[PDB]
């Protein structure tokens, strides 16, 4: 079986090599800057760390 006609077929693909880098502040996100919240956060402590 031998071909006689042909075409240059294109083929697209994608590779997700790099998810979007994110960083987050602990006390600002969880705590919203009200002083009793920061007083109530210091016991948990190193969770933010």
């Amino acid at each position: 079986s031998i071909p006689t006609n042909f075409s240059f077929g294109v083929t697209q693909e994608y590779i997700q090599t790099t998810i979007q880098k994110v960083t987050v502040d602990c006390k600002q996100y969880v705590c919203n800057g009200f002083q009793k919240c920061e007083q109530l956060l210091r016991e948990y402590g190193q969770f933010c760390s």
């Binding site: 960083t23 987050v24 502040d25 602990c26 006390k27 600002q28 800057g33 190193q46 933010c48 760390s49």
Partner: protein, 49 residues
């Protein structure tokens, strides 16, 4: 005391690793307050006058 203090206490050591780090944010102070949604009525003194 400062950002480096928070970075040191995040790593629980006097020595850390060189690099880029995310310290807790800060907020611009509110400039004041606005109270305008509902106003009352005035007392009547016309029968007095």
């Amino acid at each position: 005391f400062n950002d480096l203090s928070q970075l040191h206490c995040s790593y629980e050591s006097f020595d850390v690793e060189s690099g880029v780090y995310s310290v807790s944010s800060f907020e611009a102070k509110p400039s004041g307050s606005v109270v305008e949604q509902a106003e009352g009525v005035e007392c009547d003194f016309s029968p007095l006058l």
